[PDB]
Design a protein around this nucleic acid. Structure first.
Ligand SMILES: [Mg+2]
Ligand SMILES: [Zn+2]
Ligand SMILES: [Zn+2]
Lengths: 57, 229, 63, 108, 393, 337, 45, 64, 146, 244
RNA sequence: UGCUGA
DNA sequence: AGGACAGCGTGTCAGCAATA
């Protein structure tokens, strides 16, 4: 409950209570957890994905 | 009573294992094939080697001897409230010369509780691990060596309280320096090389440790309430 | 075990039915195996087994 | 004749003629082991060893490392010849013995 | 919510049940999707493929396809693959066009595949969906995945006529595989950016140490421990021809001369020691430029296991100064010690753990492979291991 | 300072060594460079038994590598003829079609494989050069001339049991000449192929091709071709006085012949070759110290038993020639560069 | 400890694997669940 | 079902000693003496006949 | 090229009780030097008994004419004057030299440990005559009974 | 499997000329590693081998009834006497040769006759490979089973190990590209997946909620992500997503 | 839902 | 404010038949 990720926290347990909460509070998700990053099809923010590559022109 | 009974029986087994297993075997360790398989770590144990020869042991189901019936007998073959250790699951037979029917029964009880416990234990462990993994998953080491969560909350300011991930700290223990010293030429050529050793400048950290050492020299008892006044 | 399940093929129309071609009767078997004739329906074959570590492919439960 | 059921030679690092690895195809431990026994009798070879590369495949690798002078392809071609000479002698001796025994038994 | 109302019937599950449970939609189809380009089959012991390799049985290899782009430096080998066809092994099932897509070669007329072997290099280049090509990287997983070492990357050694995926026995304890019917999954990266990570990060030699306590995970098992303990014992003497053919059969060396040793006994008959076989196998594996390692430790077999007869008091002798319990490798040459599980095994600070520290994880894998082969040749050629009834008696 | 040049000594808890000390540099003076004349002088073959389908020559004075090469040639490289394809026109038997084909492949044919040749890859048809065809066509009928009896041969029997006698050779090409009438036939006329009941029929054509016992056992020409090193038994002490008989019972019975030199009984080692290694003296605890049993170094004993396709001596000759052919193939491929 | 290590997942799996596989106090997974998963003020012993 | 044609370990042909074996057992001979009189020396062959169960005689009893 | 030569006599055939198969550990003791020798010897090739003498030599070369050894084994060598007055020749390396324990005493005795593949030897005695040794040094152990 | 719980897959078919032949000419047909005994203590297999070898030798048939052989009358004594009465050795070990080197192995091997059963589980019934195939319509994911192409559920336990290695891209490639990778459109200004619209046949997307047609742009997303936006709307809940 | 495999 | 209590929870891993 003391967690800043609605997409996490609903991939764990009691997903409908945590969805009702996140919905009646307008709770915003930053897509920084591994779960929130695998739900919307992003690259996790640890290990190999932690930096850019920035090909110079 | 159960506990103070699995004791006279255990005195006789010690006397029984010692009689046969070390030197009562027909062939000894260099030339025995069972020893030299449990003794070199290939497969098995001295308690498997025994329990194949000279004793099977005291059966224990829930940490206790086999349960009694509602009339006070542990098995239809045994009088009610029979004192012999045999009636309580003390198997003196070995797999070399098989075990009798009553001992077979207790051994099956034990072997079956083992499987039941395996199933239930795994059922609980899976859930424990799922919960743990679902909470500590976003903690990664950052480029400032601090262990932060997904939202930036600093959990630790240094991973192990010193950094130093586990697999690499195996030879940094003492008692492994006489190895790094013996293999110094290979270690410098193969990894660090003369290049890194001379591209190192230790003054800032070395002076800090000198200051710490001087302080600890002037204050042997570091719990003595230092103060100006 | 794949064995000899019955004598009446052409008649059963089951779903699966595993049959072993040339079963044998154990040369070492309990006497009760002979009270309920279980050789009307054999289950395996006798093999010459050597207990030896020779190949490098028979370790950890493989044969 | 056969481009690969037979010999493929891999000269070592630096193509050392004195260290060669012959690949013999369609061969198992029979020829491998007899030829290694016949090549070990040459005092001019310092290391001879054969090995099967993998069970699924049908091929062996001989490794001959000779001394400083000879190109390690003479030891191979001489072990072959000595093994074939031994086989010819064994064949002659065995046929003569069989004939002699047949006569001794048919007479009596 | 199917169960908000308990007094109605003909009630099929609502959305709370479509989303929220182990069946659910998050713990399934969200975190546990099903994957393409993956195989699953029973695993079999190999031992004659290097520790970093998996054996693929030519039925996955002909179906698993990697979609590689056509460029000036590969258009030759890709051309052979499109010519070999969908069913011959170094072949290809399809070729994707620059703007169009999916012109399948699976025909077996052998002429249209040649009609399309041209026009390769004839925007985004044509991509040939080639088969697995004996050097590819594959992720292998056993299903109770309880640690990081349960998924490791392997190097696609293709084997003909089988339906089993063959894996070295050093990689057993990592997976907990037991060769008693042990299905295992093999995933085929398809991006060329997950291949770089399977090579660098998920590789199976970066996985030598368990992350729980840093102690080694890969090691030899069973009869590679009873073989090495009975060869490295003090009274094992080998003639020149059993010394050789035991060194070369552990090495199978492909690059460079095999550097040998001198007989320990030179006179009544030249004879070697078995510790010398392991020595000479150790000085060939260690990389040419690097120098052999020094190592001092203890053996698993206690120095008391050998005491047949009561020990008598020697006035000036510390029995442990010269015992088979102390392992002493001095410049890559084993001088004392049995080298049981304490080395070659899953125990820390042994010979292979120090090899992995000083010279890297590929050299420790090489040492494991070569030592397995040597200890197999020994039991298969000159000695034998069995377990009768006169050793349990 | 004690040399033992000729025997593989042995106790109970294991054998002493695995060497033979007859190679280059294996001694101070006893060095070797493969003296061919020394071989041709120390080699001798002695043929003990030679019934038909048996041979037991000795092959004294050869290494284990060459003996093993000969043994592995007989088991897996000497060529034989055997059924490879089966065309089944009808088969109303209890025995399946695939099982019948299998059973037919394992039947030995008396054609000599040296007059034939290997079918080229994809040569489905075959020709007089590489194939032999045989036909089994049998039908079971009740015999009209039978009483109310139950012996299966008397009634319910024209062809109750299908044997190898029922297989007939169909001369494929000009093979009727070259092969006289009885020469190409199955080796055994009594092998039970199947069993039939009235109204049941077998009808098939079998094709026999050449091949070696290496790609399938059906093509293998010997039951077994193993060898064993000649045992050696030495009485370190004169055994006598009713311990001689206990000694004579701890061995295969012919090995220790108990003579009666004086009033007392002396045991003597009459024939060491009969001994089977059973190591039953080592259980005696008083005579394990009296006898030393080992093996002669390079003195073998072979035993070849053919199935019936070729005689055993011809089998051994063709094995030696197959090894020579391997060597010559590799010599001539080396000369190709 | 290279930057990006994701050490929390390693801690999770290192506490999990040993338990999943494997006197007047509590032992085993009961105690681990009392400590980690429940954080109870009431413990059995 | 029916007698194997060749012994599995060796390859010796035992498919022609079934009826002879049955005939020597009807004459009063033990299974040991019978297997000896047929030439089955090594026990790998002796197990091939000693433990054979002829189930072709029980399948050949249901209607055509 | 000799580093040590002496005439020993076997005192104990295997005191520790560890018994290997073809190897026997002799505990000898020099004469006229009172040096000590522990020696693992392959007794299947070279039987040794109690109360037996033997002349023992340690060398760094077998040529006894100065030329160093090349570290390569040729059974085909054409220089055949290498020491052959000796029945049992070994070849190992010294892996440990340790001055004796006694402090406050002269105690200038050294124990040199040599390994011969797997057959260890220990030579203990006055340092004055064990100077030729040094760790990692290859040495031949020639022996000849008397 | 044997009659004593000693199961095991068939790993090799060893050539008949590479098998260790015995001094009697025989050659085993099953090779059983001797390391299954020490931890499993199936001493009944070691007695069945000797009993069956004695049976095959003497033409007998011994019984293996439990509780018929005591400590005083042992089974090993009985069957070793039977063997020694046939010319073999008490302890049941006959010495073999190496079929590969041709030398008599130093150890004498324990050989005998045991009764093997063949189990009903074959690799031919338990092997699966899926590439592409029935994509489940509700989630656009591989179908499963073995009868169709049948995919392998990845699972929540496995993604955790793949990210421990820090191989984010392998975990990205696998899930997104081998599973539901879709290419949806969003009202970038209003952040709704549901809003973008296609004209009946140019087919330029136009937002239904706000009439702007040039705001719409594509975003890579899964189908179960779209399925979840649909399910959440089936309740009046709104998922407003911020496009960048 | 009854089975089965690790 | 001492309770009484009603209320949610999870639960390793893949196959087959078959049938709602
Ligand atoms: Mg298993
Ligand atoms: Zn046989
Ligand atoms: Zn809008």
């Amino acid at each position: 409950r003391s967690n800043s990720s609605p997409l996490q926290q609903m991939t764990f347990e009691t997903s409908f209570q945590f969805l009702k909460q996140a919905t009646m509070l307008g709770s915003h998700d930053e897509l920084r957890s591994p779960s929130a990053c695998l739900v919307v099809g992003k690259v996790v923010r640890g290990g190999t994905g932690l930096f850019e590559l920035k090909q110079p022109l | 009573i159960d506990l103070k009974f699995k004791e006279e029986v255990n005195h006789y087994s010690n006397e029984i294992n010692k009689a046969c297993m070390p030197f009562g075997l027909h062939r000894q360790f260099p030339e025995n094939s069972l020893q030299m398989m449990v003794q070199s770590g290939a497969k098995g144990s001295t308690v498997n080697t025994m329990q194949i020869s000279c004793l099977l042991g005291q059966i224990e189901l829930e940490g206790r001897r086999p349960p009694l019936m509602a009339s006070g007998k542990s098995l239809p073959c045994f009088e009610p409230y029979e004192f012999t250790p045999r009636a309580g699951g003390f198997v003196t037979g070995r797999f070399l010369t098989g075990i009798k029917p009553p001992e077979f029964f207790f051994h099956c009880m034990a072997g079956r509780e083992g499987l039941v416990d395996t199933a239930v234990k795994t059922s609980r462990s899976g859930y424990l691990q799922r919960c743990i993994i679902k909470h500590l998953e976003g903690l990664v080491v950052q480029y400032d060596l601090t262990v932060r969560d997904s939202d930036g909350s600093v959990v630790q300011f240094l991973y192990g309280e010193d950094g130093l991930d586990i697999p690499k700290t195996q030879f940094l223990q003492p008692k492994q320096f006489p190895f790094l010293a013996s293999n110094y030429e290979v270690i410098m050529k193969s990894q660090h090389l003369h290049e890194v050793l001379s591209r190192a400048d230790p003054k800032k950290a070395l002076h800090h440790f000198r200051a710490i050492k001087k302080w600890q020299s002037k204050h042997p008892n570091t719990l003595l309430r230092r103060g100006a006044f | 075990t794949m064995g000899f399940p019955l004598l009446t093929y052409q008649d059963r129309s089951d779903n699966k039915l595993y049959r072993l071609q040339t079963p044998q009767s154990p040369l070492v078997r309990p006497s009760m195996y002979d009270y309920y004739d279980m050789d009307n329906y054999p289950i395996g074959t006798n093999a010459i087994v050597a207990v030896i570590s020779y190949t490098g492919y028979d370790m950890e439960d493989a044969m | 004749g056969e481009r690969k059921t037979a010999l493929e030679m891999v000269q070592a690092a630096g193509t050392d003629r004195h260290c060669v690895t012959f690949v013999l195809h369609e061969e198992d431990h029979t020829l491998g082991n007899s030829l290694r026994y016949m090549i070990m009798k040459n005092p001019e070879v310092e290391f001879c060893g054969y090995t099967t590369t993998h069970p699924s495949e049908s091929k062996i690798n001989l490794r001959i490392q000779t001394r400083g002078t000879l190109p390690a392809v003479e030891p191979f071609q001489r072990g072959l010849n000595e093994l074939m000479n031994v086989c010819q002698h064994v064949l002659d001796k065995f046929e003569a013995s069989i004939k002699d025994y047949k006569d001794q038994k048919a007479s009596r | 919510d199917s169960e908000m109302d308990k007094l109605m019937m003909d009630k099929y599950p609502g959305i709370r049940q479509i989303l929220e449970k182990k069946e659910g939609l998050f713990r399934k189809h969200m975190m546990g999707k099903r994957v393409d380009y993956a195989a699953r089959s029973v695993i079999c012991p190999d031992m004659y493929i290097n520790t970093n390799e998996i054996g693929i049985p030519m039925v996955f290899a002909t179906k698993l396809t990697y979609p590689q782009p056509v460029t000036p430096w590969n258009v030759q080998e890709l051309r052979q693959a499109v010519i070999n066809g969908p069913n011959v092994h170094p072949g290809a099932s399809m070729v994707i066009n620059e703007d169009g897509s999916r012109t399948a070669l699976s025909a077996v007329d052998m002429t249209q595949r040649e009609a399309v072997a041209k026009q390769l290099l004839t925007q985004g280049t044509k991509i040939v969906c080639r088969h697995v090509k004996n050097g590819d990287i594959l992720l292998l997983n056993r299903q109770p995945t309880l640690h990081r070492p349960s998924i490791q990357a392997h190097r696609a050694r293709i084997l003909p006529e089988e339906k089993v995926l063959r894996l070295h026995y050093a990689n057993c304890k990592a997976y907990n595989a037991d060769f008693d019917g042990d299905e295992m999954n093999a995933h085929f990266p398809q991006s060329e950016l997950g291949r770089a990570e399977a090579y660098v990060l998920a590789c199976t030699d970066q996985q030598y140490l368990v992350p729980k306590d840093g102690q080694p995970l890969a090691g030899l098992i069973q009869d590679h421990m009873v073989s090495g303990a009975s060869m490295t014992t003090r009274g094992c003497f080998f003639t020149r021809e059993h010394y050789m053919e035991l060194v070369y059969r552990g090495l199978t060396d492909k690059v460079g001369r095999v550097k040998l040793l001198s007989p320990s006994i030179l006179k009544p008959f030249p004879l070697w020691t078995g510790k010398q076989v392991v020595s000479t196998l150790l000085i060939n594996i260690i990389p040419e430029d690097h120098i052999p390692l020094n190592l001092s430790g203890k053996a698993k077999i206690t120095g008391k296991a050998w005491v047949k007869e009561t020990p008598r008091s020697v006035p000036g002798f510390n029995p442990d100064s010269m015992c088979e319990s102390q392992v002493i490798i001095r410049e890559g040459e084993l001088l004392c010690g049995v080298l049981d599980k304490a080395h070659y095994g899953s125990s820390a600070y042994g010979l292979v753990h120090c090899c992995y520290e000083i010279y890297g994880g590929e050299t420790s894998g090489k040492v494991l492979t070569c030592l397995a082969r040597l200890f197999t040749a020994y039991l298969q050629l000159y000695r034998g291991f069995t377990l009768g009834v006169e050793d349990i008696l | 300072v004690e040399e033992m040049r000729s025997r593989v000594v042995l106790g109970e808890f294991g054998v002493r060594n695995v060497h033979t000390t007859d190679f280059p540099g294996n001694y101070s003076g006893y060095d070797d460079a493969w003296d061919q004349d020394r071989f041709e002088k120390n080699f001798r073959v002695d043929v003990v038994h030679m019934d038909e389908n048996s041979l037991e020559f000795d092959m004294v004075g050869i290494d284990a590598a060459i003996a093993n090469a000969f043994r592995r040639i007989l088991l897996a490289e000497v060529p034989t003829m055997a059924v490879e394809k089966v065309l089944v026109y009808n088969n109303t038997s209890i025995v399946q079609d695939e099982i019948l084909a299998h059973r037919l492949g394992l039947i030995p044919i008396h054609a000599d494989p040296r007059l034939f040749e290997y079918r080229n890859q994809g040569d489905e048809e075959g020709t007089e050069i590489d194939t032999l065809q045989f036909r089994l066509q049998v039908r079971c009928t009740r015999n009209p001339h039978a009483a109310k009896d139950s012996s299966d041969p008397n009634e319910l029997y024209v062809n109750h049991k299908v044997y190898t006698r029922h297989m007939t050779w169909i001369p494929l090409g000009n093979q009727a000449d070259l092969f006289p009438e009885g020469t190409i036939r199955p080796v055994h006329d009594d092998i039970l192929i199947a069993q039939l009941r009235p109204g049941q029929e077998i009808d098939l054509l079998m094709h026999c091709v050449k091949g070696i016992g290496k790609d399938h056992a059906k093509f293998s020409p010997v039951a077994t071709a193993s060898y064993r090193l000649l045992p050696d038994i030495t009485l370190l002490e004169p055994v006598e006085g009713e311990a001689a008989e206990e000694l004579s019972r701890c061995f295969s019975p012919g090995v220790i012949e108990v003579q009666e030199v004086q009033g007392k009984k002396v045991a003597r080692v009459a024939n060491p070759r009969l001994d089977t290694f059973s190591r039953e003296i080592f259980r005696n605890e008083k005579l394990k110290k009296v006898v030393r049993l080992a093996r002669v170094r390079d003195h073998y004993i072979f035993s070849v038993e053919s199935t019936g396709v070729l005689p055993p001596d011809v089998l051994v000759s063709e094995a030696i020639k197959v090894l020579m052919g391997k060597c010559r193939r590799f010599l001539d491929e080396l000369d190709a560069v | 400890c290279e930057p990006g290590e994701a050490v929390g997942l390693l801690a999770a799996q290192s506490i999990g694997e040993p338990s999943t596989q494997m006197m007047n106090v509590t032992l085993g997974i009961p105690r681990l669940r009392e400590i980690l998963m429940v954080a109870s003020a009431n413990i059995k012993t | 079902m029916i007698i194997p044609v060749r012994c599995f370990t060796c390859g010796k042909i035992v498919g022609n000693k079934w009826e002879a074996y049955l005939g020597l057992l009807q004459a009063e001979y033990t299974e040991g003496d019978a297997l000896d009189a047929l030439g089955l020396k090594r026990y790998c062959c002796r197990r091939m006949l000693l433990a054979h169960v002829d189930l072709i005689e029980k399948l050949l009893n249901y209607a055509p | 090229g000799i580093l040590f030569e002496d005439i020993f006599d076997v005192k104990d055939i295997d005191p520790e009780g560890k018994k290997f198969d073809r190897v026997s550990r002799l505990h000898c003791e020099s004469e006229s030097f009172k040096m000590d020798l522990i020696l693992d010897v392959n007794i299947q090739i070279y039987p040794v008994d109690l109360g037996d003498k033997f002349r023992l030599v340690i060398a760094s070369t077998l040529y006894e004419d100065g030329t160093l050894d090349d570290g390569e084994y040729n059974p085909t060598d054409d220089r055949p004057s290498r020491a052959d007055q000796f029945e049992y020749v070994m070849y190992g390396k010294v892996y440990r030299i340790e001055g004796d324990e006694t402090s406050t005493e002269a105690a200038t005795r050294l124990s040199a440990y040599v390994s011969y593949g797997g057959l260890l030897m220990r030579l203990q005695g006055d340092a004055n005559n064990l100077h030729g040794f040094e760790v990692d040094s290859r040495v031949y152990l020639l022996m000849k009974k008397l | 499997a044997s009659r004593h719980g000693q199961k095991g897959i068939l790993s090799r078919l060893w050539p008949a000329e590479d098998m260790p032949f015995t001094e009697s000419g025989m050659v085993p047909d099953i090779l059983f590693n001797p390391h299954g005994f020490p931890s499993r203590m199936t001493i009944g297999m070691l007695i069945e081998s000797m009993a069956g070898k004695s049976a095959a030798l003497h033409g007998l048939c011994h019984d293996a009834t439990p509780f018929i052989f005591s400590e005083e009358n042992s089974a090993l004594e009985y069957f070793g006497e039977m063997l020694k009465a046939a010319g073999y050795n008490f302890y049941g070990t006959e010495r073999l040769y190496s079929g590969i080197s041709g030398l008599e192995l130093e150890a004498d091997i324990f050989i005998g006759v045991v009764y093997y059963q063949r189990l009903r589980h074959m690799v031919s019934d338990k092997f699966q490979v899926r590439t592409t195939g029935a994509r489940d319509r509700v989630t656009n994911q591989p179908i499963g089973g073995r009868n169709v192409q049948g995919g392998i559920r990845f699972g929540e336990m496995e993604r955790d190990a793949l990210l421990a290695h820090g191989t984010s891209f392998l975990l990205h490639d696998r899930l997104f590209n081998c599973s539901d990778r879709s290419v949806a459109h969003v009202c970038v200004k209003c952040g709704s997946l549901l809003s973008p619209l296609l004209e009946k046949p140019n087919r330029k997307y136009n937002c239904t909620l706000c009439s702007r047609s040039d705001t719409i742009d594509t975003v890579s997303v899964p189908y179960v992500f779209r399925y979840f936006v649909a399910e959440l709307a089936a309740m009046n809940i709104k998922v407003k997503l911020d496009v960048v």
